[PDB]
């Protein structure tokens, strides 16, 4: 059936900072290494 | 084809699972109770009576199905009345 | 307080601009209300952020990659400098209301709607607060003899 | 991003000593010493 | 010897000054905070 | 030490302001507590970079990008310069009485701003109210005609 | 041998120098040990950044930016160049007499920052207590209409 508008896709960034030692520092982080994915992909889309 | 995916399936549910018991609607209007009772200590012949509230996830659910927005048919349900400026399947969507 | 890397930009293109005319002094007592001496509206805006670009967008000469250059580091004020930065494009006498000059006032306009409800709310909210004081006491006279 | 800044200026509950002493002593490092000539 | 005392800091710790609480409505304070506001209701100079 | 990056743009702006004019040598000089002569200020500023700070905070002109460069390169510093740098912005005597009638005022203002939402929302809403009834006019018109 | 970067700052500086005046090429020449032709001190400042950071000590107007961009690419060169370039200071007779009188009193100073906090903590209270008191009363009329 059509499948495309009952799902989205997969796809998440975010950063996090802190100051410390009056020194700023950032890590950004992307959605595949949170579910410890070694290969980023596109392809996968989650249902709503 | 739609391949399904284990593993992430998983992880998702793993996450899911505390968070569905920390999330519970049973445990939503005994807070919403428990703030009225605190903050009323009047005699409720003045302010205009009574009030009443009413939540329906199973309305909201719909709308979210249908790409459309939850608030937008609640605040058509104070003036019952429609505007005529979107269209017809949105006029549809918006009178069921 | 004001970030040093917009500050070494912003600070000379004003002073350059107090020291080419002083006719900004109504501009600067106006628009911000700040005391009428110089190094007062310069304390302003070294202190506070929504001021400097208050003064940053009085002008055009020279401040606009400055304007840019805080638009850029600080996204807070974007949206408090695009409401403070409204004039009312008084006409066009054609019928084609294009979206060059007109698109910020009907967005406004949709705005107010989308808030409000129907655009014949708005207009009757509008007309209701445009009306007299005493339509209110009549309102109020009405109610206490008791009709409703 | 999702922004802290909110959630970032907050204070800790402050409480006092018995006794008093060792404030300012927070960030200070003095050289090594030597061990003594060998012969 | 002073009544209201014990009553302040006990509607501040449950929340209700004249209606009782129920079994499961029952929430968690620490006790900083009560300790934060002692400091106010009942002032000394000795933290002990 | 002072950085070279910071020292680069400190010490020759201090030189030209000392050349433009030495009366502010022997002022700098009681600020400071050095001796006098340029070159033991100059040692001073190379020296500590809270002396550079207090410098270029003495000299007003020239010395705004060279301050603020350093408090750029040197985050450390800024606490105890704002600690040693302050002076008594001065009071006005009808200040506190003329700030004790406003409090009627914003009352009202705080409980407009929560009920429409936040200030810029109630901002948006007054323009929206001042602005001119034939752009509700237009509006209708577009809405009529098909334009959402 | 010596950075390019390092070396196009440099090198016409000092040729420069030689060109503005010539009684310091016998100088730089006693002061490194090298011959007192120009083609013989230029081709040792561009062979060895040590002998390239003396020379940009000797002369000192022109040299100021060239040498703190040495001192900028060059890490490893400072800690030496700072050991050959050496001269003490003079001191006072009465310097160490002057300051036996003040243990009595930095002793006091400390004691007072020992209960007060950090020395900045003790900064901040006197600039308090030598405050005016139409601010104790701003505080308490803000906390008056309910501003915190």
Same mark, same amino acid.
């Given at each position: ?48 | ?5 284990? *593993? ?5 549910? $793993?996450?899911?699972?505390?968070? *569905? ?15 009225? #009772?605190?903050?009323?200590?009047? *005699?409720?012949?003045?302010?205009? *009576? ?22 937008? $048919? ?12 979107? #269209? $017809? ?8 | ?6 500050? !070494? ?93 007109? !698109? ?45 | ?39 | ?48």
């Amino acid at each position: 059936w059509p499948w495309h508008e009952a799902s989205t896709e997969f796809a998440y960034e975010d950063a996090y900072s802190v100051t410390i030692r009056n020194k700023r520092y950032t890590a950004e982080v992307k959605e595949f290494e949170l579910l410890g994915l070694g290969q980023r992909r596109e392809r996968v889309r989650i249902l709503k | 084809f739609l391949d399904v995916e284990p *593993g992430i399936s998983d992880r998702m549910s $793993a996450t899911l699972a505390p968070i *569905g018991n920390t999330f519970a609607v049973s445990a939503f209007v005994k807070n919403r109770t428990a703030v009225y #009772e605190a903050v009323s200590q009047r *005699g409720t012949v003045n302010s205009n *009576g009574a009030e009443m509230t009413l939540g329906f996830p199973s309305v909201v659910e719909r709308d979210y199905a249908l790409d459309r927005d939850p608030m937008v $048919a609640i605040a058509a349900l104070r003036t019952g009345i429609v505007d005529e400026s979107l #269209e $017809a399947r949105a006029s549809n969507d918006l009178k069921r | 307080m004001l970030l040093p890397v917009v500050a !070494r930009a912003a600070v000379p293109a004003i002073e350059s601009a107090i020291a080419a005319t002083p006719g900004l002094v109504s501009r600067i007592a106006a628009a911000i209300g700040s005391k009428v001496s110089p190094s007062a509206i310069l304390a302003a805006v070294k202190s506070n952020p929504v001021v400097a670009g208050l003064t940053l967008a009085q002008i055009g000469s020279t401040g606009y990659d400055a304007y840019q250059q805080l638009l850029e580091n600080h996204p807070e004020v974007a949206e408090m400098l695009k409401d403070l930065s409204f004039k009312a494009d008084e006409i066009q006498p054609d019928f084609i209301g294009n979206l060059g000059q007109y !698109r910020e006032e009907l967005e406004l306009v949709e705005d107010a709607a989308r808030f409000v409800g129907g655009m014949s709310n708005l207009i009757r909210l509008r007309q209701a607060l445009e009306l007299d004081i005493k339509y209110y006491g009549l309102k109020m006279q009405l109610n206490d003899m008791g009709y409703r | 991003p999702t922004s802290m800044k909110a959630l970032d200026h907050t204070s800790i509950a402050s409480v006092a000593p018995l006794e008093r002493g060792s404030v300012d002593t927070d960030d200070r490092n003095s050289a090594p010493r030597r061990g003594a000539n060998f012969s | 010897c002073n009544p209201e005392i014990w009553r302040k800091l006990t509607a501040y710790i449950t929340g209700s000054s004249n209606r009782a609480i129920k079994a499961d409505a029952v929430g968690k304070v620490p006790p900083t905070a009560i300790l934060e506001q002692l400091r106010t209701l009942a002032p000394s100079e000795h933290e002990l």
